[PDB]
Amino acid sequence: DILLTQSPAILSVSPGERVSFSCRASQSIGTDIHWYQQRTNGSPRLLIKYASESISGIPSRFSGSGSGTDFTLSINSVESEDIANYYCQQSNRWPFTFGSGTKLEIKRADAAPTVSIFPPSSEQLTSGGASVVCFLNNFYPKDINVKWKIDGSERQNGVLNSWTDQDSKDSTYSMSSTLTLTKDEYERHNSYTCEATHKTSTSPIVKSFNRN
Amino acid sequence: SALHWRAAGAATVLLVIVLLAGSYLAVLAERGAPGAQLITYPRALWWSVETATTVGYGDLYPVTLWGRLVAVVVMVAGITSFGLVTAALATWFVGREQERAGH
């Protein structure tokens, strides 16, 4: 069976630049290579067929070339919506096979996070539980730390964090940090604060709220 | 019309049916066989044409038992059809030479 090699596995490009994905076959397959795009949590979408043939609905920015064992998928002027995984697939010999995929990354200008802190809902408190949610939205680069403080004292237990992949709308990243406590544990403290430390500022961005 | 022209016409229509059915059946037989190339309908139809004509470029061919049996039917249909057109042309010429000679 035909091995389809996609290297590099990750490609970082600046906005508006032409970019080229590589797909190499273990043996000659004519032009029987097809390209698919798969955005986060979406299904694959055919971009190019038989190496260079256009698909209706796909932006002119996308083009393909090559024949034999070496193929290339190109994008003229990359933009945020192009952030995704790209796969090649061959139909020259049975069985059909897929390449290992190349993820596209866009390097945009630095952006400080927009921080929002949220108090537990009344509906949740009614069930004997309390989650304080903090959003660190649309920042760049993706490296960031969140620190929790209850009544001025740092907290680590009960915290779960989550990071999105680079956003296909604006090339930024976002993160959520959730501190979960029992209604009681929550009832015996006054202020809750969320602090974000990010490259864009030597000083932390802090958001707080008092239980009453 | 005369028999030989009718047989030729019939043979042609029949040949075309064998080419189409053969392209389709070749793909069914060959998918599932590692290395097989005769696995998409457009090139299989091209393959059926190169088989019925015996041109033999050599770019495509069956690797499975049934793909090979299908190939044999296409070859025989093709060889027979072209052989039958030749026989029809000969019959036409023989009749014409008879006329040109006063018989």
Next chain:
Amino acid sequence: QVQLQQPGAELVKPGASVKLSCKASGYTFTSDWIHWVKQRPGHGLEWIGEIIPSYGRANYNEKIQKKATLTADKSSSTAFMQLSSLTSEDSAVYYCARERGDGYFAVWGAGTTVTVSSAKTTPPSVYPLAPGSAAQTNSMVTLGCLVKGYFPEPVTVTWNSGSLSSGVHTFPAVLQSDLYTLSSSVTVPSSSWPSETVTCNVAHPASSTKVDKKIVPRD
């Protein structure tokens, strides 16, 4: 219109089997092949097998342990994939795709998330995330929804039934003690809320539930 319809999810106990379905609409030919592709989290696409409905013949990836069996019901235009004796290795999203016999997958299903676990199904609790009373605001305001205590994945979160897409982030779920949790963020011009209503719609396929939670300012 959606050409290939697949169920959102299937929860399967270790050792058990499940039958995934793929209902096709749109042009249908006797020459179409329906393919199935597996994608484990963070990984690529793996071809599993194929079937031609008009004839009933199926081919399989021979290179991997055979977990699937493909069949098709011509009258209901549905293709099926029987996965048997599953382990956590079989947990993944399974796509069905249509190929017109010319080599490429022209269109794909949305995928069915299969989770192999002993745990029980659990619908999510959806809570509002409205700003505290001391929070200041610029030309934009951020609201959200907490979706916790559900199993298995996934959940689809939309805002205002899909009419609100811009300014939305739905964070990946975190698994803790057999339950998932995630939050979704939405940002609209500060002037537009609460005059204009903002509701998140949370759908959880495994439990056949879909709930709405309107976001209103704290008292």
Next chain:
Amino acid sequence: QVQLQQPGAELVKPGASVKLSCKASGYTFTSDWIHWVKQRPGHGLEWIGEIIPSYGRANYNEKIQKKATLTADKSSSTAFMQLSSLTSEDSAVYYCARERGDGYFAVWGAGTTVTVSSAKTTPPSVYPLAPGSAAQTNSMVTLGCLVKGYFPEPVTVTWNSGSLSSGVHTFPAVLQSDLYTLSSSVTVPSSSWPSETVTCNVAHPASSTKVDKKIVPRD
């Protein structure tokens, strides 16, 4: 005689387009293909595309961003290449070449220098370079011409309308503040000058100018 005729240069503003032409003479067949090749300074030859005039069909390098469109006028035996939405990356010499359908480029045009810049066209000022009064001399003497303040490239410098080729050096131009400058050197037997006249002919395609500057001894 010159088989393929191309204009010397074309100045194009960023974002604009230009149509290069290639006029053919000599034997012409319905089977000839006219090719276009790009060569950036200091780099190799890059195939852009081809066209068969008798039919009007064109093929292009698919591997590079498509900037060109090929057409041909059969009645004037001219092939054209439309380059659109140019950037400095498109600045280069573009050759046209004739292929008799047997694979190799038998003959080439002189090439058209395309410069993509916002700057304006400027004809060169040609100044004489004659030895100072205290300069000593052997059996040979060196004279020259200063060609400065022109844009864009190129300029063709000849001595005595081309009759004087031996002992000639034309140095590469230097770009400074949107203007180019170069000098040309010529060496003849010291005895032959000034008895025998020495003139440099400077042609600048972009400005459609060609001037002569006779070199005479300083007073």
